[PDB]
Design a protein around this nucleic acid. Structure first.
Lengths: 90, 70, 100, 44, 69, 870
RNA sequence: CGCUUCUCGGCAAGUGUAGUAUCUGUUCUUAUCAGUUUAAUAUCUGAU
RNA sequence: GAUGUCAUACUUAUC
């Protein structure tokens, strides 16, 4: 029993730019094995990242436990990955 | 077009015995021509005044009976 | 309720058992589903509140928290003098979301 | 420069030649190409 | 369907004039029997008392307009 | 499909630029068919090619093709297929529809969602196929039979609703004729399903409609299986209908008294179960009707032992509160020894029946507390308080209810002295059951019987149960809060010992331990103000103000709830975490995408706006009002109700001049649940402050050429009128030209909003002498009753029901005049519905407003009583 | 020599359910009689 | 004016 809006990939917005890969792997890997993590390296895409997990239930438990996580002084938000919303800049 | 003549009720033969047994190709067209100058000029020859009681009157005998009853 | 057109009420003989509401639907009316200007409480039937059905929500059906009451628009339009506003059958509402 | 497409009082598009309505701007530009629009352009 | 079976006198789309007239006469008889002012007016208009007027109103509830058609 | 592994190319193709890594298709656009489901849709892979080779049954293949859009298609495609199947259910027929739906639902490789969609399609095609599924009644009853015995409650409720719809559509003779060979079947599960279906049909069609058929099925002496199926159907009808078989209790008891006398023990057990269900359904009732049932039951319970004796003991325990005081005292004095002798029974069903009967055996006078504490409570503590009873839910809840009944009857201290030793055990389920029993004993009886030698041990056991929690259940925190509320001032040498454990649990590697500590601090927040503890609460608030950096959002929401509980239990302007250093600290906390944490932040912002509005420099509120528009459009139904109150409090504090412009600018968003929430917030701001200051501005949003903004302004005006009520008599003339111009628009949504605003103005200004504006609104809403939309028809019906109560039933009868005898049936049905609504609203007022009707030839319709004058 | 205050110039809010108003790809110049239905049209069913 | 496929937008303090 899972909603169809959830997926294996999760998007993070308003992320700190001084965060390293180890801190992101420790924050994303707390709910399960993370398959991949891509951080933005563009001025138009700064503060956003995409974390794809190996399991769908682990990705849902990670997305349920990352919306509003305590970070450095920004309001980071975790949301589900959408194909029509990620390609809005093109 | 045939669809605009079939949906609006056109191409339907109607006989009006008041105005010399004229032909009408629509019920709404006959209702619009009933309160007109031609139907009033046809009804003025029989002596009936142009009122609202003779709107749906078609035959001359029924209109004469409605004029004599009032 | 007014949102789901397939929801039907009991419309039975209302006794002396007062209706209850859950925490998710606290303050809302039974018919108009409004939370402004309450005027009269809801009277449940004898079959809708018996045994394990006592102290339950009339709209949702879970555990009750507060007392159910109707708004002023239902008391002025004589809508509270009808039968018991208890939702018995649940059709196309909160059923497909649990399986998905 | 289309002299038939106008703006209504509800934030929509209206074709007075064919007397059609369109909610968004993407449907008004796609309504010029068709059978009824060509028939209204040829009849007038 | 169920509204005509639960509350009598509602009506439907295929309701005749005789049944509606009988329902209106029954509602008028119930309003005359319920309200004391109409019963007092009916007792002051005739020479009978309130009990005879109530018995005449109760005996006229069965087919107040006549046989149906 | 959703858990399948993907390659690197599929992961790279689903990501945009600017990121650094740290035949098989049937007829085209049909969805993917399963390899095991290529039997029902085997005729869809080939082309149709309709050219003099297309029978009617090939159109039924289209009824299969929409089924291909219904099983595994798109949800808009599934909605379109359901609409095409419901709109064409009479034209397609029930025959081929049932012949295509019966092997699809009977597949051994189905799923839960496909079965739910098939049940929804069968329920949706049941309203248009009335009086036509009588040959197809058995084919639907054979598919709906295992749905009532399923594990899920929603599927069982859907099967019961489908059985009730089939019983309402097929009548009573066809359901009795179809289930007549289904009673003497060889399979016991099919016979039980047929008995449950017959009980559901008897509950949906009435008890005397199936009472002589059930009496003839129970009185027939041909086999024990038919009598057992009839007794099971009677037991299911008694367990389904609680208080509905109470007038029909004597006719059921006269049929149940004929059983339990044959040589078959199964029929006697079924009759005892039916008698127990009839005693538990109508209780306290059926005292005189059960006098002839206790005499064989006592003989069967005293002469034999086994499952039938346990069923007779359960029936006696169910009928013992349904008797008098002397009868229950005589029955309890002769059944306590049989209950004590059955305590060492190895069977689980007999032990569950004994635990269910022990709760009803001691519930009134007659049973002394000393004998129940001496000879009943030690065997109940030695035989039922085990580890295996906490595994099953039905064996744990009944044991907890029996323990609560024994604590309410004998005493709470004698049960608390024996239940405190299992609180520090190694099992989580037994400790949770002991904590739930302690919470029930503290809530029902209290803690006045607990002395000082047991309260510290109970507090230590509760601390050991809370500190050794492995699950996410809130039973232990609720039990600790109930124990603290029952203690009150007796927990005064316990607050430092709890604070040292709550502060140590906030710093750990796990994330659920800090959330559990914050929930325990929030549950014990009201016990500190009544115990003269102000420094500990001020220390806990200063700790929670700095402990908001927990990375888990479930711990941050619990910390926010604990801070809100500490701010509610203490003063708003006397908190060591003051409002001047907390409201800017929660302004980035309100932008969280969580459900409970954002709702707690919105509740804290509303409390800080309602109680501490003088603690800001009138600048952070205008910045938080722009963030309040982003707090809506959430699927929780809790933050959207508090954001409107927070916006109303901000408009009452900082003046309704800045939030109204933001609410008008946020009304043009073209998104669901974002325009109604801003309209509700604007209505709450107009109701909290003066409604006149938002009066021309609401007249300005209709001036912009937009349909959504005008609809939002009309909804805001209707909600403000509904919130005002009697105060809308002065704002009716300013809204009357807007309601007159909104009803003449071509859009039906604006006309429905204007009809709702007119209904709110009629229901609010009823009885104030404003009938002219109500009549002017009714004269424009009267052509809006002929719409085809159900929402517009419901809005017109609400406007008519408001105008009948505001302008009077005479104006409603005059507006509905000359429409009952109309030639057009589409207007005559609406006029008859309006006349029925006016008669249901006011039936006595239609006598004086009735028109004068002349007398006919055979009948008379002239009212001669009201025509006479003195 | 150091500290503090004021002013000026440059530097991704998603999913599921209920209904509804529009164009976009298209169809009927079959001439009478009888039946169901429609306020009246339209449509369907059998015989030249 | 209707039909049947597709798209857009709207409503009921729906979740």
């Amino acid at each position: 029993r899972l909603p169809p809006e959830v997926n294996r990939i999760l998007y993070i917005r308003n992320l700190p730019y001084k965060i390293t890969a180890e801190e992101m792997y420790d924050i994303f890997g707390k709910y399960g094995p993370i398959r991949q993590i891509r951080v933005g390296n563009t001025p138009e895409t700064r503060g956003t990242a995409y974390v794809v997990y190996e399991d769908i239930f682990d990705a849902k438990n990670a997305c349920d436990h990352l919306s509003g996580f305590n970070v450095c002084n920004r309001y980071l938000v975790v949301l589900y990955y959408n194909a029509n919303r990620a390609f809005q800049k093109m | 077009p045939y669809w605009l003549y079939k949906l609006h009720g056109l191409n339907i033969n109607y006989n009006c015995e008041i105005c010399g047994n004229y032909t009408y190709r629509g019920p709404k067209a006959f209702q619009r021509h009933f309160a007109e100058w031609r139907h009033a000029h046809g009804m003025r020859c029989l002596g009936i005044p142009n009122t609202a009681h003779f709107a749906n009157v078609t035959q001359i005998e029924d209109a004469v009976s409605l004029w004599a009853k009032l | 309720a007014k949102h789901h057109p397939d929801l039907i009420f009991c419309r039975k003989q209302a006794g002396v058992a007062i209706g209850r509401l859950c925490e998710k639907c606290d303050g809302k009316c039974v018919i108009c589903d409004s939370y402004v200007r309450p005027c009269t409480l809801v009277r449940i039937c004898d079959e809708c509140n018996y045994g394990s059905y006592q102290g339950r929500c009339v709209i949702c059906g879970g555990p009750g928290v507060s007392d159910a009451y109707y708004c002023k628009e239902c008391t002025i339009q004589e809508k509270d003098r009808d039968g018991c506003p208890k939702i018995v059958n649940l059709g196309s509402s909160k059923t497909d979301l649990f399986y998905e | 420069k289309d002299p038939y497409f106008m703006k209504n009082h509800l934030g929509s598009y209206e074709c007075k030649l064919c007397l059609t309505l369109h909610n968004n701007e993407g449907s008004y530009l796609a309504h010029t190409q068709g059978k009824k629009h060509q028939t209204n352009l040829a009849r007038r | 369907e169920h509204l005509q079976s639960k509350y009598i006198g509602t009506g439907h789309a295929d309701t005749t004039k005789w049944e509606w007239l009988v329902n209106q006469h029954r509602d008028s008889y119930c309003s005359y029997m319920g309200h004391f002012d109409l019963l007092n007016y009916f007792a002051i208009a005739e020479n009978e008392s309130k009990a005879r007027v109530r018995f005449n109103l109760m005996e006229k509830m069965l087919q107040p307009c006549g046989p149906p058609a | 499909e959703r858990n399948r592994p993907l390659s690197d190319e599929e992961l790279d193709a689903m990501f945009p630029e600017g990121y650094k890594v740290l035949n098989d298709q049937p007829s085209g656009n049909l969805p993917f068919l399963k390899p095991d489901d290529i039997q029902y849709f085997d005729k869809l892979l080939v082309d149709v090619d309709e050219s003099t080779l297309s029978p009617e049954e090939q159109k039924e293949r289209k009824i299969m093709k929409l089924l291909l859009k219904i099983k595994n298609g798109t949800p808009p495609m599934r909605k379109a297929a359901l609409r095409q199947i419901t709109d064409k259910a009479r034209e397609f027929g029930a025959g081929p529809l049932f012949n295509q739906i019966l092997p699809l639902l009977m597949s051994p490789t189905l799923e839960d969602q496909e079965r739910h969609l098939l049940v929804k399609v069968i329920d949706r095609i049941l309203y248009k196929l009335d009086d036509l599924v009588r040959p197809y009644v058995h084919k639907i009853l054979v598919v709906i039979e295992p749905l009532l015995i399923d594990e899920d409650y929603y599927a069982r409720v859907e099967g019961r609703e489908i059985i009730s719809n089939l019983a309402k559509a097929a009548g009573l003779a066809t359901m009795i004729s179809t289930m007549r060979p289904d009673i003497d079947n060889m399979d016991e599960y099919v016979r039980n399903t047929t008995a449950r279906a017959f009980a559901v049909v008897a509950s949906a069609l009435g008890i005397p409609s199936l009472l002589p058929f059930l009496k003839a099925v129970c009185k027939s002496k041909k086999s024990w299986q038919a009598r057992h199926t009839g007794i099971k159907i009677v037991q299911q009808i008694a367990i389904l209908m609680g208080c509905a078989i109470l007038p029909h209790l004597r006719s059921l008891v006269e049929i149940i008294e004929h059983g339990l006398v044959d040589e078959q023990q199964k029929v006697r057990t079924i009759s005892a179960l039916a008698i127990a269900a009839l005693a538990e359904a109508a209780t306290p009732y059926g005292i005189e009707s059960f006098d002839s049932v206790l005499k064989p039951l006592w003989k069967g319970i005293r002469q034999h032992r086994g499952k039938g004796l346990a069923a007779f003991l359960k029936a006696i325990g169910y009928l013992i509160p349904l008797m008098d005081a002397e009868y229950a005292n005589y029955y309890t004095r002769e059944v306590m020894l049989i209950l004590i002798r059955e305590f060492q029974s190895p069977d689980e069903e007999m032990k569950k029946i004994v635990l269910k009967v022990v709760k009803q055996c001691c519930g009134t006078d007659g049973v002394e507390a000393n004998y129940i504490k001496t000879e009943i409570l030690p065997p109940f503590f030695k035989h039922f308080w085990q580890h295996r009873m906490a595994l099953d839910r039905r064996n744990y809840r009944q044991l907890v209810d029996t323990t609560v009944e024994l604590a309410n009857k004998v005493g709470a201290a004698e049960i608390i002295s024996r239940i405190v030793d299992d609180l520090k055990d190694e099992a989580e389920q037994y400790r949770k059951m002991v904590m739930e029993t302690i919470e029930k004993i503290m809530g029902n009886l209290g803690a006045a019987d607990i002395d000082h030698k047991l309260e510290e041990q109970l507090i230590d056991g509760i601390l050991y149960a809370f500190q050794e929690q492995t699950t996410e259940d809130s039973v232990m925190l609720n039990g600790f809060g109930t124990v603290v509320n029952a203690l009150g001032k007796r927990v005064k040498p316990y607050l430092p010992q709890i604070c040292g454990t709550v502060l140590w649990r906030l710093n750990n590697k796990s994330a659920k331990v800090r959330q559990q500590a914050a929930d325990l601090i929030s549950r014990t927040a009201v016990v500190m103000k009544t115990c003269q503890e102000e420094k500990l609460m001020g220390h806990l608030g200063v700790v929670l103000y700095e402990y908001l950096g927990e990375e888990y959002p479930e711990v941050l929401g619990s910390i926010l709830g604990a801070l809100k509980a500490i701010v509610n239990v203490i003063g708003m302007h006397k908190m060591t975490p003051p409002i001047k250093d907390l409201l800017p600290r929660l302004t980035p906390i309100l932008k969280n995408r969580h459900e409970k944490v954002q709702e707690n932040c919105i509740d804290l912002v509303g409390r800080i706006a309602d109680r501490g509005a003088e603690y800001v420099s009138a600048r952070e509120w205008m910045r938080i009002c722009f963030e309040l528009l982003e707090l809506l459009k959430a699927h929780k139904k809790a933050i959207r109700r508090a954001t409107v109150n927070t916006f109303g409090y901000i408009a009452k504090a900082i003046g309704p001049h800045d939030v109204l412009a933001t609410l008008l600018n946020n009304l043009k968003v073209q998104e669901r649940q974002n325009r109604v929430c801003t309209t509700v917030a604007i209505a709450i701001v107009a109701e909290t402050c003066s409604p006149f200051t938002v009066l021309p501005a609401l007249m300005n949003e209709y001036r912009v050429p937009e349909l959504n903004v005008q609809n939002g302004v009309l909804k805001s005006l209707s909600f403000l009128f509904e919130y005002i009520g009697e105060m809308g008599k002065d704002y009716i003339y300013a809204v009357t030209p807007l309601l007159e111009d909104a009803l003449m628009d071509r859009d039906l949504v604006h006309r429905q909003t204007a009809s709702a605003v007119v209904q709110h103005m009629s229901l609010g200004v009823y009885g104030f002498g404003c009938e002219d504006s109500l009549n002017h609104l009714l004269n424009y809403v009267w052509p809006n009753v002929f719409e085809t939309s159900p929402h517009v028809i419901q809005a017109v019906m609400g406007a008519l029901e408001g105008l009948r109560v505001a302008i009077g039933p005479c104006r409603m009868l005059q507006y509905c005049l000359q429409g009952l005898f109309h030639p057009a049936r589409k207007v005559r049905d609406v006029y008859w519905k309006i006349y029925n609504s006016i008669y249901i609203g006011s039936q006595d007022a239609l006598i004086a407003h009735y028109p004068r009707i002349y007398n006919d030839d055979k009948n008379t319709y002239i009212r001669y009583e009201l025509d006479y004058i003195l």
